[PDB]
């Protein structure tokens, strides 16, 4: 699909 904002920016991972 068309590009969208990267939703993982600013999030911590575990």
């Amino acid at each position, epitope marked *: *699909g*068309k*590009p*969208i*904002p*990267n*939703p*993982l*920016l600013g*999030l*911590d*991972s*575990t």
Partner: nanobody
Amino acid sequence: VQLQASGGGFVQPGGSLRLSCAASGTTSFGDTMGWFRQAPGKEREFVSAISRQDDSHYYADSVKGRFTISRDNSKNTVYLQMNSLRAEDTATYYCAEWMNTRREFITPYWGQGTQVTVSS
């Protein structure tokens, strides 16, 4: 893009649901799988993602601690368990697979949604 979400339905507040996101197994779009949700009249909201570099799990602040994302692998499926649901979690839930860019934008490859309605 065959990425069907299932597991939706009617649930009472406090209940749980386990959603399923069945990937191709033939084609990978492909290092990250995330769950998004969309409610009538609201903006699309990112929920959770699982990304392979070693399995990394991401959660939106609004579902952190209540939701769990996981993968079966043997069945090419990503699960989203949603616990202690509330009226504001009502929405269509759907998956996308993408390559984590670590940049401003991603290119999502979208699956079809399943409906979750939290009501009395």
